[PDB]
Design a protein around this ligand. Structure first.
Ligand code: HEM
Ligand code: HEM
Ligand SMILES: N=C(Nc1ccc2c(ccn2C2CCNCC2)c1)c1cccs1
Ligand SMILES: N=C(Nc1ccc2c(ccn2C2CCNCC2)c1)c1cccs1
Ligand SMILES: C[C@H](O)[C@H](O)[C@H]1CNc2nc(N)[nH]c(=O)c2N1
Ligand SMILES: C[C@H](O)[C@H](O)[C@H]1CNc2nc(N)[nH]c(=O)c2N1
Ligand SMILES: [Zn+2]
Lengths: 421, 419
């Protein structure tokens, strides 16, 4: 690979020079003859519960991370650096794994976020509260840690980014897993007539919860129970205390009828099914939370045809001409729904960011990373917002996408792999 | 290996085998993705990279083979004779000439293979004008006038391409210096701002230096600047009756007409390079019709173009003090309603981004069934507004390079030695 790669911003003519791509250690999925940039889950962005490192695989992955850590604290080559290398190597030799120091765990989690090429929110990466839950042994203990996380991160609406890290993978038969895809999500219920009540995206998981014993209220916005797996055991159900679940009723500054739609959303997005990889170690349960960009709710959750799918009903109440696509009735209603989401979160003093502010901040972050770090991996397909793409600055920004470690990765859904006791 | 692409809205999975036929590079590697880079080295053609006899026969052979495979006569007597005829011609002249059937097939397939074009459901309906006998800029003017008249068709636009003589030694290139046949001038003002289209300031300055008398307005149609056989380019005025324009008005906002906006009906790209069988056609203006967002989102609302969001939101009496009011997004939709309404009212062909992306999904389905795949660049296919409420946003695409193809080339004023 060439030593310097340039990216151009076609609106400002700013040219940035990337050298950090030379440190890439993981594959993207593309080849020299095909680009897979729009594939959602290439196998290179995933981790199966089985590519558990052997001793020999683990040694160089650990050294690479330890070297990167001691380089960051300006102690590369120090006595402490060499002693830590030797301690880790002895641990891998005698136990086939090793334990991160608290300092290294925090560094690793922050950098997995810093390295997440699909995240537009990374200007915040160094402000992450890391909760060490590696002493957890039971699903009840996981519930405790998760409740404390939710309460801390919610902070009565002044949201604070946080991650809780449960024990790392050992032999693959003792995994900790949060079976939920997010800590807070709404149930979906398939009806005998083919319609769906609630959130269609969560129908499969809802059915699992019901099979495990959950009694469903069968409403439109039912918060799902936690389904928590500790030490490879069968998962167990817990209800999050409702006072810990902050929600926002959606209303519109101009349209008084918008509140009659009965819409609401939860304030805290907390992804709970990804895998955190640090120095070859695999943290299969690592729920992390930030705050929302408004389009996540107003465009995707509400307006995707496969989700709540509200464009028609909103357009009807707006008295729009819906008989031709070229009236752009869908586009008009989409904007008004996203106005409503931002207005409702701001009115209730729940942290949220609009897509103009978020992408403008991301450009500033990217430029700083190029200047201070030598680059910033970014996935244009994910960074550009799902509405009004070209009136945001990231649309015009060339980006380079590549995979650095530590990293967040996808992993198979646990019900597809779990061996029931 | 076979590669699968999934639509995450409809769960339709398609299986791509056509990518196995590409030999050109993408710019990506196993360790870096360049999918959002606008002009990687792999989508451009420099004049110095002229082909030699040695490079040209395998490229010619590949193209003849796929042509005769396409008419289901691979290995036939005609196929054998054509390969021998082409071989002798490269040998004795360092190049070869396409048959008329091959030129048409090659131009249609360059369009079919254009991974960034959402309009490709139309690919087999393309009028091909053979201009390979042209020798002078006056001849180029005539061919281009005939193209504009044919394609405009009084508003019932018809896709067309005019193909001028191929590159020989690189010192005798035919070039249209305009980026599109019809574009509006842009002028740097004393106070540092730009009048007209900022995208065309440099080309406008060259026309002025060459003697064009500028009206210094907001929507002045530029003259044609035409280069034949490597000679200095010459200026020509397209006859105004041939230039179809649309004044922009809004169906509800009667004040919108007072913005004084207009656009032209015929998008006609004239600075790309057509590559067929190793031959390079450096002047190949091609035209279709607009998707509304090209004008309403990019031309009018890019900060670096006409940049009208603030004026429109002013007339809409929107609160512009905070971005979270989405005042830009509101004005953006109303501008794009006006563009579509105005073309439709004047019976000028245009497609909205909902209809266009819907047609592209159907096109992909067609191509996967009959051809084994469809190269597509998500970054370009997804429209610049309302992305995820169009079906292509949810469609995984594979991007790969097939030939014949359209490629970028350097602007002629960076290469040209003036005699
Ligand atoms: C602080 C405020 C944050 C904002 C506004 C934000 C914004 C976003 C958005 C809008 C997406 C795309 C989500 C989608 O389309 O489904 C995303 C993706 C992502 N975020 Fe952030 N985020 C924030 C914090 C965080 C934190 C704290 C972490 C982890 C510690 C994180 C890790 C990620 C990852 C890994 C992805 C992409 C997942 C993938 O690779 O597919 N984000 N973010
Ligand atoms: C007939 C109706 C057509 C429609 C609606 C259409 C639509 C579009 C649009 C919206 C773009 C993106 C333009 C931009 O963002 O600047 C595009 C790109 C493109 N179009 Fe089509 N197009 C049509 C016909 C054609 C024809 C007839 C040709 C050539 C014979 C063609 C060749 C191309 C190419 C090569 C590109 C991509 C340029 C690149 O590779 O960077 N299109 N098209
Ligand atoms: N603002 C956010 N939103 C968001 C929502 C869902 C997300 C992500 C990253 C992955 N996911 C899921 C993964 C499964 N597929 C759907 C997307 C980010 C954040 C969540 C956590 C910190 S910030
Ligand atoms: N509907 C169209 N629109 C359009 C506009 C500009 C285009 C293209 C393809 C390349 N260009 C230019 C190339 C220089 N860089 C800016 C884009 C297509 C069409 C033009 C011709 C047939 S259809
Ligand atoms: C097929 C395509 O990759 C897919 O729809 C992607 C597009 N970009 C995205 N971008 C974000 N931020 N989130 C998404 O879920 C998607 N989906
Ligand atoms: C940096 C990025 O590639 C650039 O802004 C692209 C994005 N997608 C695009 N898509 C289309 N159709 N046309 C464009 O000019 C662009 N520009
Ligand atoms: Zn790629």
């Amino acid at each position: 690979c060439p030593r310097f790669l340039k990216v151009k911003n076609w609106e400002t003519e700013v040219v940035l020079t990337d050298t950090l791509h030379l440190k890439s250690t993981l594959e993207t999925g593309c080849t020299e003859y095909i680009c897979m940039g729009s594939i959602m889950h290439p196998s290179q962005h995933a981790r199966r519960p089985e590519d558990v490192a052997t001793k020999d695989q683990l040694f160089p992955l650990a050294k690479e991370f330890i070297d990167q850590y001691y380089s960051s604290i300006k102690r590369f080559g120090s006595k402490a650096h060499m002693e830590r290398l030797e301690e880790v190597n002895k641990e891998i030799d005698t136990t086939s794994t090793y334990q991160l120091k608290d300092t290294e765990l925090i560094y690793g989690a922050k950098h997995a976020w810093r390295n997440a090429s699909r995240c537009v929110g990374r200007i915040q990466w160094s402000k992450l509260q890391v909760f060490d839950a590696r002493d957890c042994t039971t699903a009840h203990g996981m519930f405790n840690y998760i409740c404390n996380h939710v309460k801390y991160a919610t902070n009565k609406g002044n949201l604070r980014s946080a991650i809780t890290i449960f024990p790392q993978r050992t032999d693959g038969k003792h995994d900790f897993r949060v079976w939920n895809s997010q800590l807070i999500r709404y149930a979906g219920y398939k009806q005998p007539d083919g319609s769906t009540l609630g959130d269609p995206a969560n129908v499969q998981f809802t059915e699992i919860c019901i099979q495990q014993g959950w009694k469903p209220p069968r409403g439109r916005f039912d918060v799902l129970p936690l389904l928590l797996q500790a030490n490879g055991n069968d998962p167990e159900l817990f209800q999050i205390p409702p006072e810990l679940v902050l929600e926002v009723p959606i209303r519109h500054p101009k349209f008084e009828w918008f509140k009659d739609l009965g819409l609401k959303w939860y304030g805290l997005p907390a992804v709970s099914n990804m895998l955190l990889e640090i120095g070859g170690l695999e943290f299969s349960a690592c729920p992390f939370s930030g705050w929302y960009m408004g389009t996540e709710i107003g465009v995707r959750d509400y307006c995707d045809n496969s989700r709540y799918n509200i464009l028609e009903e909103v357009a009807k109440k707006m008295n729009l001409d819906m008989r031709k696509t070229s009236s752009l009735w869908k586009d008009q209603a989409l904007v008004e729904i996203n106005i409503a989401v931002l207005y409702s979160f701001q009115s209730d003093k729940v942290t949220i960011v609009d897509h103009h502010s978020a992408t403008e901040s991301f450009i500033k972050h990217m430029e700083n990373e190029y200047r201070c770090r030598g680059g910033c991996p970014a996935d244009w397909v994910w960074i550009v917002p799902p509405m009004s793409g070209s009136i945001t600055p990231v649309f015009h920004q060339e980006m380079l996408n590549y995979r650095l470690t530590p990293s967040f990765e996808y992993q198979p859904d646990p019900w597809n792999t779990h061996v029931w006791k």
